Structure formats: structure tokens, C-alpha cells
């Protein structure tokens, strides 16, 4: 509703480490996938959230 | 000179703020062609007769 | 290839103003270009495939030594890739350009009495696709501009509704036209989808995938001119300028 | 009664000598109290709430 692709994406990710904290696996997994997507920029957050 | 890699951002998305006009010399230099010439011909021969 | 890798009409035009006849000529034999052939095609059925000959091919194909034919030899160049069997060109017109055969009257070449609605029909136009009927389309202006024949060339389209929505806007005479063009005339490039290297059934099909398939290769090889890499290296005439213009225009 | 005035400042303007002269000596100023004088590019894009 409101923020850009990067907050959008970040603060998602923040939020996948306080729901799944007995599981810290899947939050690095998706920061692994994000940093190589992320180079590209707001176009590879796109691709992240496709 | 070798060339230069910019990001894969910069391509995209890259701006640049440049006036992209050139002014003519002349006026300097048909105005005062013996001042200018003596200029110029000083400053580059400062710098040959030390190769 | 290199002709069907021209994605704007600078370059096209480009091309073709360094382009000489020569390369429109094929000097093989070819066969008949209509013809109702069976080919075998395995990949797909035990039976063979019938098919058609038609004159938009990659491979040479006989062709009528008037006019007639030099004018379709030189479409069927920049549609298919590859022309047709013209004998004994005399050595002067083979030397010219390919935009100076249809934009220049220095040629003994006489066009006056060319009909568009015929060649369309030879170069059998129902089966190209929209970038391969733009790339006609071209052609046809630039000899109707240095014919005169600029009406005959608008009521032929006026006959043909969608030739008309899709013709490419330019003159052939100013070259700020041809700069503002957005038009995209580019038959093989780079695939965003995903291109195996299975065969086609049809003759224009399997022979289209071979030059994309062979663009690509082309694409990755050391004869492909990269310029964010290596613009410095590139002569002064053939680096890309905003100032670039064709001779005369 | 209420109503909206837009202040643009005061300008002292000196009469028998040329208007557009002066007007350009308060053109330069002008342009330094909008922030417009020098090269700029306006982000007012993040100034929202929902």
C-alpha cells in the first residue's frame, strides 16, 4: 500500500527472522537468494518479490 | 586508456548533468593575438624541453 | 545474418549503403522456386513431410534475369538472408550498393514500370511475418521515391489494410526521419525465450532457426563487436555518432 | 472573513532609471530565497502518509 521495493522487500525479510526464529535456515536462504539479486537494483527486488 | 566498466545500474538507470556547448576562443584570440600566442607557445615549451 | 540482425532503419540503411550487389547474388544453381517437394523431417514423423519452394528462402533459387528478378533478389536478401541465381551481371552493377540499385539513377537499371502487387505475390507476401513485410515495405519506397511513382506506391497500400497500419514512416530523402523511426525490423537477435536446437517442419521455419541459431553463435564469437568493451578500438567511420548520416539524404 | 496570501517578499523599486535593470538584480535574489538558482533535481516523492 505505501513504502518502495526495498523497504518492501527488507522489512519482509526482518519479519521471515522474527516468525520462523526456531528456524534460522530460512532466513538465510532468502538473503542468500536477495544478494544476488539484489545487485541489479530496484529491478532485481522486483524479480525477488515475482 | 582502457575502458571503463560502469555498473549494470548505471547503464539503466544512469544520469548524467552536463552543459554539452562549447564556446569559441576566438574573441580572446583575435583580440589579442601576440599575448595569447606568447601565452600558449611559453606554457607548451615548459614542457617539450624537458623530455 | 548480418543483414537480419538490423534492428532500426539507420542501421538497415547502413547496411545496405555498404552492402554491394554482389552479396544479393547467390551463384548457386538453386532449384525451381515453385514447387511442391516432399523433405524428410525425422524428428518428428517416419513419413515425409510435404512442403513448398518459395522464393523467401536462405537457399539460392532460380531467378528471371530482368529487372524483374534483380529487384526480388534484393528483398529476398533482406528478408530471407540469401538471394537468387541472376547469370552474367555485368561487373559494374555487381560493384554498387544495394541502396544505390534502388535509390539512385546513375544504374542503367529501368524500374519505371514495376508493379508492387505482383512482386508482392512472387515474393509470396501471406506467408511473411510483420517484421519481414516492414522490411519489404522498405524497399518498395525507396524505389517508388526515385521512380516518382510515389502515388502508385500509396494506392497499393490503400488496397492492402494492414500493409498500410504497419508501412514504416520515413522519407527516403531526409534523413531526420529516418533517425526519429522507432520501427524494430530486427528477424534474428538475441532470444529472451528460450531457443533449442530442435528442427522445424517447414522449409522457411527450419532455415529461419538456422540463422538464429547461428546469430547466437556469432553473438558469443570473437567477430562480434562488443562497444562498452571496446569502443576505443573501433575506427572513427564506424563508431557509433549522433552525427552519423548517409551519403546525400 | 479569512483568505490565503502568498509572501513573496518586499523589493525596493527606485524611480527615474530603467525597471529591468533593478528587476534583474532581484531576479538572482529571488531565485536564492526558492532554492533554484543552482542546478536541481526535486524529490518530493517520499513526503506522504497514508
Same mark, same amino acid.
Not at chain 3, 525425422?42 to 531467378?63: A, F, H
Not at chain 3, 524497399?139 to 517508388?144: R, T
Not at chain 3, 538456422?210 to 562480434?224: A, E, I, T
Given at each position: 500500500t505505501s =513504502? *518502495?521495493?526495498?523497504?518492501?522487500?527488507?522489512?519482509?525479510? +526482518?519479519?521471515?527472522?522474527?516468525?520462523?526464529?526456531?528456524?534460522?535456515?530460512?532466513?538465510?536462504?532468502?538473503? +542468500?537468494?536477495? %544478494?544476488?539479486?539484489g545487485t541489479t537494483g530496484k529491478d532485481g527486488y522486483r524479480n525477488w518479490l515475482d | 586508456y582502457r575502458p571503463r566498466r560502469f555498473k549494470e545500474i548505471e547503464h539503466t538507470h544512469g544520469y548524467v548533468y552536463r552543459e554539452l556547448n562549447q564556446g569559441s576562443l576566438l574573441p580572446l584570440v583575435d583580440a589579442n593575438l601576440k599575448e595569447?600566442?606568447?601565452?600558449?607557445?611559453?606554457?607548451?615549451?615548459?614542457?617539450i624541453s624537458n623530455v | 545474418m548480418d543483414v537480419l540482425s538490423k534492428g532500426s532503419l539507420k542501421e538497415l540503411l547502413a547496411h545496405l549503403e555498404k552492402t554491394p550487389l554482389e552479396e544479393a547474388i547467390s551463384y548457386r544453381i538453386g532449384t525451381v522456386p515453385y514447387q511442391n517437394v516432399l523433405i524428410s523431417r525425422?524428428?518428428?514423423?517416419?513419413?515425409?513431410?510435404?512442403? %513448398? %519452394?518459395?522464393?523467401?528462402?536462405?537457399? *539460392?533459387? !532460380?531467378?528471371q534475369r530482368n529487372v524483374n528478378g534483380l529487384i526480388?533478389?534484393?528483398?529476398?536478401?533482406?528478408?530471407?538472408?540469401?538471394?537468387?541465381?541472376?547469370?552474367?551481371? =555485368?561487373?559494374?552493377?555487381?560493384?554498387?550498393?544495394?541502396?544505390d540499385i534502388l535509390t539512385?539513377?546513375?544504374?542503367?537499371?529501368? %524500374?519505371?514500370?514495376?508493379?508492387?502487387?505482383?512482386?508482392?505475390?512472387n515474393l509470396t507476401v501471406s506467408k511473411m511475418n510483420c517484421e519481414q513485410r516492414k522490411?519489404?515495405?522498405?524497399?518498395?519506397?525507396?524505389?517508388?521515391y526515385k521512380d516518382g511513382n510515389q502515388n502508385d506506391y500509396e494506392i497499393y497500400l490503400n488496397q492492402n489494410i494492414p500493409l498500410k497500419q504497419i508501412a514504416p514512416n520515413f522519407i527516403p530523402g531526409d534523413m531526420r526521419t529516418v533517425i526519429h523511426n522507432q520501427d524494430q525490423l530486427a528477424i534474428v537477435g538475441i532470444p529472451a525465450?528460450?531457443?533449442?536446437?530442435?528442427? !522445424?517442419?517447414?522449409?522457411?521455419?527450419?532455415?529461419?532457426?538456422?540463422?538464429?541459431? =547461428?546469430?547466437?553463435?556469432?553473438?558469443?564469437?570473437?567477430?562480434?563487436?562488443? !562497444?562498452?568493451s571496446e569502443f576505443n578500438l573501433i575506427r572513427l567511420k564506424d563508431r557509433d555518432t549522433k552525427y552519423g548520416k548517409l551519403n546525400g539524404w | 472573513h479569512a483568505l490565503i496570501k502568498e509572501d513573496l517578499g518586499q523589493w525596493p523599486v527606485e524611480t527615474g532609471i530603467s525597471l529591468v535593470n533593478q528587476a534583474g538584480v532581484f531576479a538572482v535574489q529571488l531565485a536564492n530565497k526558492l532554492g533554484i538558482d543552482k542546478p536541481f533535481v526535486l524529490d518530493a516523492g517520499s513526503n506522504y502518509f497514508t
Open positions: =513504502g *518502495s521495493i526495498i523497504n518492501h522487500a527488507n522489512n519482509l525479510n +526482518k519479519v521471515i527472522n522474527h516468525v520462523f526464529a526456531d528456524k534460522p535456515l530460512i532466513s538465510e536462504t532468502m538473503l +542468500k537468494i536477495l %544478494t544476488i539479486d | 595569447s600566442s606568447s601565452y600558449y607557445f611559453k606554457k607548451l615549451m615548459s614542457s | 525425422n524428428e518428428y514423423y517416419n513419413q515425409l513431410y510435404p512442403d %513448398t %519452394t518459395s522464393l523467401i528462402d536462405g537457399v *539460392s533459387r !532460380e531467378g526480388m533478389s534484393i528483398i529476398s536478401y533482406v528478408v530471407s538472408g540469401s538471394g537468387h541465381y541472376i547469370p552474367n551481371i =555485368g561487373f559494374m552493377l555487381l560493384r554498387r550498393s544495394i541502396l539512385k539513377h546513375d544504374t542503367g537499371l529501368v %524500374t519505371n514500370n514495376l508493379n508492387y502487387g505482383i512482386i508482392a505475390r522490411r519489404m515495405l522498405i524497399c518498395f519506397k525507396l524505389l517508388a525465450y528460450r531457443l533449442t536446437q530442435s528442427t !522445424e517442419l517447414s522449409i522457411r521455419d527450419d532455415n529461419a532457426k538456422s540463422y538464429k541459431l =547461428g546469430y547466437v553463435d556469432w553473438y558469443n564469437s570473437n567477430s562480434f563487436l562488443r !562497444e562498452r | -
